[PDB]
């Protein structure tokens, strides 16, 4: 299934994405069933002028900007309103504090000290130690014998 | 937060009773945590082996809760005996016992 979520907001900010939280809500769920690994947006370009043979002369591109974030498997503690609308969220693997918020399952924590997780040191190399053969069996006396 | 001692009992009881409910959605090694599903897709020869795993898991998760409630009830009973002693010796009288 190919899932699409959208949210259309009137903004005033100068160039980049705004700061207020807003929750996307799905449009459609198409049962396509194909593999997707790559994609590309489609633009609308005016033909400002025509040089006879270029085919690529007057393609102006208006004035817009678009962004491509990527989704990663993360745990987000969400905040549902009374009507059912999401209003806030926090990460978990962001920093220790988001980890605190996740662990305690509340959006305001009170002064104290809270255990969140553990940690272990990771091994660095694999060393394989099998008999390399020291006083080798006499295979040089059979396979190299001058007199069979 | 002046009534923290009273609020901790309620919060502990709620947390234990909530963990009791949320153990109803555990496989415990079974294919599915929902009991009619393993009924609806496996024959009685092959269903009992999973229903029995759910039985052991849920019965153990109930035994744990009952034991923890037994331990916590003794603490509340000690607090209640202390409160009865205090009401006797300090509301119904005047105590020479320091502090």
């Amino acid at each position: 299934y190919f899932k699409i979520y959208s949210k259309h907001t009137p903004i005033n900010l100068v160039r980049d994405l705004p700061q207020g939280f807003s929750a996307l809500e799905p449009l459609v769920d198409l049962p396509i069933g194909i593999n997707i690994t790559r994609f590309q947006t489609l633009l609308a370009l005016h033909r400002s002028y025509l040089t006879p043979g270029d085919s690529s002369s007057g393609w102006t591109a208006g004035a817009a900007a678009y962004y491509v974030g990527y989704l990663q498997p993360r745990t987000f503690l969400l905040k549902y309103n009374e009507n059912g609308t999401i209003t806030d969220a926090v990460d978990c693997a962001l920093d220790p504090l988001s980890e605190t918020k996740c662990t305690l399952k509340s959006f305001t924590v009170e002064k104290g000290i809270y255990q969140t997780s553990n940690f272990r040191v990771q091994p660095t190399e694999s060393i394989v130690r099998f008999p390399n053969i020291t006083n080798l069996c006499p295979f040089g006396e059979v396979f190299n014998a001058t007199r069979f | 937060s002046a009534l923290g001692k009273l609020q901790d009992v309620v919060n502990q009881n709620a947390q234990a009773l909530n963990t009791l409910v949320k153990q109803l959605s555990s496989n415990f090694g079974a294919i599915s945590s929902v009991l009619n599903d393993i009924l609806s897709r496996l024959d009685p020869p092959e269903a009992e082996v999973q229903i029995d795993r759910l039985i052991t898991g849920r019965l153990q998760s109930l035994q744990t809760y009952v034991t923890q409630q037994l331990i916590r009830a003794a603490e509340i009973r000690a607090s209640a005996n202390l409160a009865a002693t205090k009401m006797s010796e300090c509301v119904l009288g005047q105590s020479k016992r320091v502090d």
Binding site: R120 | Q15, Q23, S25, S26, G29, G57, Q68, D99
Partner: protein, 49 residues
């Protein structure tokens, strides 16, 4: 340190979190015990030389 064990362990729910929550509660209670016995004095009195 065995991921094959840990994924199978997650099928048992929150037994491990429950055990950790039980042990931390009696860990803090030990500091409470010491606080209630000895820290019964406001200030730190000294005897004269």
């Amino acid at each position: 340190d065995s991921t094959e064990c840990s994924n199978l362990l997650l099928q048992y729910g929150s037994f491990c979190t429950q055990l950790n929550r039980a042990l931390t509660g009696i860990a803090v209670e030990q500091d409470k015990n010491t606080q209630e016995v000895f820290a019964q004095v406001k200030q730190i009195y000294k005897t004269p030389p």
